[PDB]
Every structure is written in structure tokens, then in C-alpha cells.
DNA sequence: CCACTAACCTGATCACACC
DNA sequence: GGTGTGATCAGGTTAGTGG
């Protein structure tokens, strides 16, 4: 069970490509500003820039420093809750992550990263 | 039927706090 | 140097979009 896939409007597509053309490695500030200007949540914008670099790099292989997101602070209380969840299921779907986001107060996009990191190291 | 791609993934690495 | 862990990189996989 994954998040429902959105569909770019023509005006959104134009804005993402034009910003990608100026810098394919935007920082959190550029992603946030672009996300608000076009009405899309920032994680979807980040996912698009990653997919779009994948398209461009694979295409160029057949032809040819902006600031990061601030480190999310995770309390021991939040960590213990995600830990207990991680033991029952290491691959929570969108609904289980929204649950964990609700119970922890952390954004769901950070829960997704937390599980990606945890599975690679534990 | 099938090309395209958002969503999601692995694995490695960056970045930074901390000792 | 060593450890821990959140964030991001390249790029492969899963599944929804729409020709």
C-alpha cells in the first residue's frame, strides 16, 4: 500500500523542469519555495528531482552546493516508538507511516527516511 | 498490450554531533 | 579516529497513467 500517485499539471511540469535546468541539485530552500509556488508537497518535489536526474543521466549515457535540510531531531520517546514498530514490520505502508507520523509528531517523509536508514543498518 | 514514470527501494556516502 | 544517525547521492524496482 503506497501513496496515491499524483499527476502533474502542465504548469507544474514547466516549473519543475525550468528549476531543474538552472540547478539539478537544489537545496531544501529551493525545494520548499518551488513546492509552494506550484502547490505540491516538498517531498514529492524532492522525489521528482531524484527521478529526473535518473532520467537525464541514463539519457546522457547513451548520447554524450546548496544547503541541505536541517537534521531532524528525534527524541528517545519517538525513537522507542518507531523501534517497536520496526520490529513488527520493517516495511510499513503509507497508512502505517501516517499512523507513526501522527503518534510521533514527525512528518511522514521523515518516517520513510528513518525506516530506509534503519533497514540498511539493523 | 505496452511505454512512461511517481513512488519506493538498496547501497553508499555525505554531514554533523559527540566522545 | 571511532560511532551513531539523519539526509542525499546513483540508480534499480514496483505499480499507476494513459497512449
Q: What is the resolution of this structure in A?
A: 2.1
CB count in 10 Å sphere of residue A17: 12
User: What is the distance between the alpha carbons of residues A122 and A117, in angstroms, rounded to a whole number?
Assistant: 9
A109 near A43, Cβ under 8 Å? Answer: yes
Where along chain A do its domains lie? 3-70, 71-122
A40 near A12, Cβ under 8 Å? Answer: yes
Query: Which residue's CA lies closest to nucleotide B9 at its C1' atom?
Result: A116
CB count in 10 Å sphere of residue A77: 9
CB count in 10 Å sphere of residue A38: 18
User: What is the distance between the alpha carbons of residues A8 and A38, in angstroms, rounded to a whole number?
Assistant: 10
CA of A122 to C1' of B11 (A): 14
Residue A98 DSSP SS3? helix
CA of A39 to C1' of B11 (A): 33
**Burial (CB count within 10 angstroms: exposed 0-12, middle 13-18, buried 19+), residue A106:** buried
Query: Which residue's CA lies closest to nucleotide B6 at its C1' atom?
Result: A5
Amino acid at each position: 500500500g503506497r501513496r496515491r500517485r499524483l499527476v502533474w499539471t502542465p504548469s507544474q511540469s514547466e516549473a519543475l523542469r525550468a528549476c531543474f535546468e538552472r540547478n539539478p541539485y537544489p537545496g531544501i530552500a529551493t525545494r520548499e519555495r518551488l513546492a509552494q509556488a506550484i502547490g505540491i508537497p516538498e517531498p514529492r518535489v524532492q522525489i521528482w528531482f531524484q527521478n529526473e536526474r535518473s532520467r537525464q543521466l541514463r539519457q546522457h549515457r547513451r548520447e554524450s552546493p546548496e544547503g541541505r535540510r536541517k537534521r531532524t531531531a528525534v527524541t528517545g520517546s519517538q525513537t522507542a516508538l518507531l523501534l517497536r514498530a520496526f520490529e513488527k514490520d520493517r516495511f510499513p505502508g503509507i497508512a502505517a507511516r501516517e499512523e507513526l507520523a501522527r503518534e510521533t509528531g514527525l512528518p511522514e517523509s521523515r518516517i520513510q527516511i528513518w525506516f530506509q536508514n534503519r533497514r540498511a543498518r539493523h
